[PDB]
Amino acid sequence: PQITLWKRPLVTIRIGGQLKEALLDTGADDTVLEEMNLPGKWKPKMIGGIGGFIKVRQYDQIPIEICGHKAIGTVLVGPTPVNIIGRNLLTQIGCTLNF
């Protein structure tokens, strides 16, 4: 599909038995999801945005379904105000910017 930018580019994502709304975010290197207790190994990390850094948990090789397209990769979990789909996954679903 083509998504215009008049409104926030929010789309449905699925990660396990959790369906969530997430921002397709070309300004995000990484994918950052709201707090969720995912299984398996993780590593602590700090990521920085406009107003400073937050502490997140880095989970690797997590399958995530974005608008019905399959992806699998690193997901950062922590106290973000919005679920953010970053470039690590946007490239996997074939996402480009066009103008």
Binding footprint of a second copy on the chain (CB under 8 A): 1-6, 8-9, 23-29, 32, 47-54, 67, 69, 79-82, 84, 87, 90-91, 93-99
Burial tier of 46 (Cβ tally within 10 Å: 0-12, 13-18, 19+): exposed
Residue 39 partner contact from ligand 74T, a second copy, none using kind-dependent CB cut-offs of 5 to 8 Å:
none
How many chain residues are in contact with ligand 74T, going by CB under 6 A? 15
Q: Are 13 and 83 in contact (CB under 8 A)?
A: yes
The verdict on 48 binding ligand 74T (CB under 6 A) reads yes
Rounded distance, CA 89 to CA 3, Å? Answer: 17
